[PDB]
Design a protein around this ligand. Sequence first.
Ligand SMILES: COc1cc(/C=C/C(=O)O)ccc1O
Length: 272
Amino acid sequence: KLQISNTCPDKYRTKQEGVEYPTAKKITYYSKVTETERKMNVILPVGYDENKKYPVVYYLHGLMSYEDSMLEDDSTLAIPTNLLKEGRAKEMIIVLPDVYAPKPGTAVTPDFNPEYYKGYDNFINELIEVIMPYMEEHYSILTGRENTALCGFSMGARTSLYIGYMRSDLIGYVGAFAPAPGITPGEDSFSGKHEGLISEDEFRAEIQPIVSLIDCGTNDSVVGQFPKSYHEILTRNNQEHIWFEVPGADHDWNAISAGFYNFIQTTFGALN
Ligand SMILES: COc1cc(/C=C/C(=O)O)ccc1O
């Protein structure tokens, strides 16, 4: 019963008086991938009961951000609770990683350059080898692709699409809010040639995402027409997905909240 909306109503992205919201806890954990101690926020659902098990959404920030950045607007914490209260989302655990996970010897200062991007690309290893096992060991989670969502903004949305299609066996639900250039070959004004992580014909999955969703503002000054280009390539490749544009929005929380609002309505069987 999917009804995509091109904006998030204020009442779903705002904390409502008299409603309890979950809180983030910052976790420090060791990564064999970066060979360093790293941080992530874990947001347990209201009333978290260790004798229950919960599905998990991993939500990835953009370039030059960090694990608290998706908490700077209340949509992240408010939307899943506000949908839950209307029976339109499932109870879930939300994880906000630090997505910049360079191998030792390759950490560089944030900037629009290929060497800095490599640390985001390496997040596929951080997520699968370190963060997912940590969550299974330390929290009462549901495992399996039907219980696992991955979404992100801008560079984190590029990274979500890359991981969600290359390892669709692990990730049931993929959400990409204004994804950055360079999943596939391309060229832009911020850093010139992007060689592409994969070719366009390779941007596909053997086992299909249960849900793949992509959005973007119509006037995004940072990633421009790249999200639309991904829609077009996925369509050419017969990859089922949802695409929509947020009218007049830029690289901003209107585009993000619209994406997350539609995405969380689909995750974990919420539509039955
Ligand atoms: C990978 O190349 C790019 C990444 C971005 C990401 C911006 C963001 O995450 O806010 C913007 C322009 C680029 O050329």
